[PDB]
């Protein structure tokens, strides 16, 4: 995938028993040369770095401080913690949205920040304030959290967004700006069909002809009380119908579960899929409930059956 590349490496090959410090809610990936990269939902947002994509070690945060103008768009909030970023590489620049926000609210605006490199060791490295994105309020039936990035077949770059309220959004976006084409109308695509519509964290991928959506559904952020599970649809138009593998229409609460936790890793969400040819590897947290239901990373092969639909063996 040109915006998220990962190179000649076998995901199907590697060992993924994780180990270091792997904290972590909301994770994306990007490699770049022999590192690898976790941005997730933290105080700035939080950086994690990797030698081999297996053995993480925290690398500190995008921002020191909130941007100013997010104080416009959601006033009320009066701590640094950024939510669940997006990653893309697009044009020699990497773009990284990010959701400005408060729990329970949908008074929220997703943020752009912009850099030509992800090694702070190199005399390039800066994160540039690129402003605001899409953004949400009271008096709206979205909420402009949980932003996703993917190209379609034409080579167009769509964002995805959303949790709870009428569910998933889907907007074009203008390929000089990377923010919402000015002509461009917002398109909901999911939904649980029901009160409360806990669904949330979509992520977009094109595999063989089908664009899969990938999202969250339940509840998160209720550590080992959480009822999170991971679920995918798919349509052969970006714009959607999405449907699940029986033929249930996301907006009407289907989803393909392809995770719902054990006993030892509860509420699997907010998942990121990233390819390496063929291969293909899931990315979401997971609360731990022998570690006090702490959301950790997890990175696991994720493989296709003959009829393109995704799976983890585990299952
Ligand atoms: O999960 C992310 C964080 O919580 C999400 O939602 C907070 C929720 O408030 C309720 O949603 C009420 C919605 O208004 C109706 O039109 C819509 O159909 C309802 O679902 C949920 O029970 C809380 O988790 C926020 O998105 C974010 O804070
Ligand atoms: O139970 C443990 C969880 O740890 C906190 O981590 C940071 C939280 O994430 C914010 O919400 C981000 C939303 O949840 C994502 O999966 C949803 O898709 C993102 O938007 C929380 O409000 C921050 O506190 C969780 O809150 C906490 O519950
Ligand atoms: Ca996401
Ligand atoms: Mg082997």
Known sequence: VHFHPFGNV???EMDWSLKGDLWAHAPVIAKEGSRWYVFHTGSGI???TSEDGVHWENMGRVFPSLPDWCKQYVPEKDEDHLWAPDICFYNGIYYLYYSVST???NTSVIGLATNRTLDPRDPDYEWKDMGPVIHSTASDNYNAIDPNVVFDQEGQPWLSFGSFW???QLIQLDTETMKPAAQAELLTIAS???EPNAIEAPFIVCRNGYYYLFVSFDFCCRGIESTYKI???RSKDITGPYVDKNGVSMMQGGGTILDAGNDRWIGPGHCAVYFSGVSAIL????????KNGEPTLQIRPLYWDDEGWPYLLEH
């Open 283 to 290: 990315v979401n947290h997971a609360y731990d409930a022998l």
């Open 10 to 12: 076998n995901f199907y």
């Open 46 to 48: 939080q950086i994690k």
């Open 166 to 168: 009428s569910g998933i």
């Open 103 to 105: 729990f329970g609210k």
């Open 192 to 194: 649980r069909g029901e």
């Open 231 to 233: 679920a995918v649809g």
